[PDB]
Design a binder for these strands. Structure first.
Length: 57
RNA sequence: ACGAGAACACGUAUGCCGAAGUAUAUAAA
């Protein structure tokens, strides 16, 4: 049960409704979506990291 | 399998214009 720390050094747009909107934190929805899209881009197998991983916001 | 994805804060125009470094100032002894 490890935790990850994120440093950016470049400004980030995270969005709620419109591109001119700004939000500070994002939810496990967008995070899990990103992990899924990068898993598919890598061409790895998705079953393992679909129904076993629990992510906090 | 991210309220996403396309997307040059771009284009036009300058330090310009009138102005004298002048006026007196026995090269005495």
């Amino acid at each position: 049960t490890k935790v990850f720390k994120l440093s950016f050094k470049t400004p980030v747009h995270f969005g709620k409704k419109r591109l001119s909107d700004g939000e500070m934190t994002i939810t496990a929805d967008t995070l899990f979506s990103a992990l899924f899209i990068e898993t598919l881009q890598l061409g790895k197998d998705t079953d393992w990291l679909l129904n076993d991983l629990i992510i906090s916001d």
